[model samples]
Target: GALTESQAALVKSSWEEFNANIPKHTHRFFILVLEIAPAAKDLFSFLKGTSEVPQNNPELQAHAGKVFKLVYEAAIQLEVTGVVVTDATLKNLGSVHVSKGVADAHFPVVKEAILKTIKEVVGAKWSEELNSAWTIAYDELAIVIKKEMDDAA
Candidate 1:
């Protein structure tokens, strides 16, 4: 299903606010993900070399920025296509995850982390509609990535 026009508006506006301090939020978001999936840190090229998830750094920010940006970019796609991602993106995603050793279980783990980070950072801005929109977008994003993963398998 596609995001209603209003939902897309909300996604874009909220993302504008969220991107204000990208490094800080992204760092917090990634830390939260690793909190839930501690060992999953190694799946990342930048973090795998470190003993623990480093605080803010050029390397850490680079990957976290990409991951966070992926959501906002998906929101942009959903606004136009209803579907949150392109097969080309998902194909690339599937291959990346497959090579990185991401399991099916990792999707929900990261989703939980994503929702939590949004709620915590978005703070007063969090609402039923916004939550619903982000959840759907992220879920759809994950679904396609997994579908690509299974198709590849």
Candidate 2:
């Protein structure tokens, strides 16, 4: 479903609060991802190298920053344009993930992790309606990514 104006406002405002602490929020997101899908860690070379290091390893931190920034920017683009402006980027990401042996199943795991992280960070502002809005937004992106992966195959 398309986001209602109120839902869009909530998403944009919630993102403003969330983006202010992108690094921390993203780090927590990955921690949750690993916890939910421990084997998924093997997909990341930087993570393999940082296996014995703390979660805050610099390389991991840098990667997390990049990932979070990408998501943040994409979310903003979707808000302003009602379309994903990161087609090339998403396609590139899909290609890379496919090469890394990522499958469609993994997207749902990551999506769940993202929503869980949003719920945690957004705290009292979290609502079922907001969750629905973000879910729709993410599902649209996932469709594009999945199509790219399929095309690559």
Candidate 3:
């Protein structure tokens, strides 16, 4: 069935709320990585690579681990849903060491937004109920990114 005007309005508001929140969350991770652990700076770095490292150096690994923790912790603090900590991000992070660019950044956040939106609309557990398409896309991007970073690194 089609949504009524009020229902559509609620959806519009929810969408805007999500759009506003995602960048805020991404920035939260970026700033936390920057401010809390300067050594983690390498984790955001990228280079032309034929083969990418799957792991960070000891210091970078420690930083990535902490960043993952901080991200999840921040999510909980903000009362949000899941967090994404990519293997490629951890790897590229050690080599290139930079915050994710907005274009490079939106996929996961957008995926989460869709998941959360459906859950909000459905009023039930959509995690298992949902298909694997988004997760697959998210994971595929991770693999492609890892390869790109490796080839570029």
Root-mean-square deviation of every model: 2.3, 2.5, 14.3
> Could you give candidate 3's per-residue lDDT for residues 54-127 as a string of tens digits?
23244434443343232222223222223333455456543452234323443354345434433453344233
Provide backbone clash counts, one per model: 0, 0, 19
Q: Rank order by lDDT, top first?
A: 1, 2, 3
Pick the TM-score winner: 1
Residue 145 miss distance in model 3 (angstroms): 1.0
Highest lDDT model number: 1
Question: Each model's TM-score?
Answer: 0.84, 0.82, 0.30
Tens-digit lDDT track for model 1 on 1-153? Answer: 257888777777777776778788778888888788788776787787788667777887776666666787787688787566465766877777777777898888888887887787668877788888888778777777788877666
Task: For candidate 2, give the lDDT of residue 98.
Answer: 76
TM-score of 1: 0.84
Model 2 weakest 10-residue run by lDDT: 67-76
**Once superposed on the true structure, which residue ranges of model 2 sit more than 4 Å away at CA?**
52-54, 65-86
Tell me the spans in candidate 3 whose CA falls farther than 4 Å from its real position: 1-17, 28-125
- Model 1 misplacement above 4 A: none
> TM-score: which is higher, 1 or 2?
1
Q: Write the per-residue lDDT of candidate 2 for residues 46-146, one digit (tens) a residue.
A: 77756642466676677666654555455556667777664677778777777888899888888888788778878987888888777767776777778
Can you list the residue pairs that collide in candidate 2?
A: none
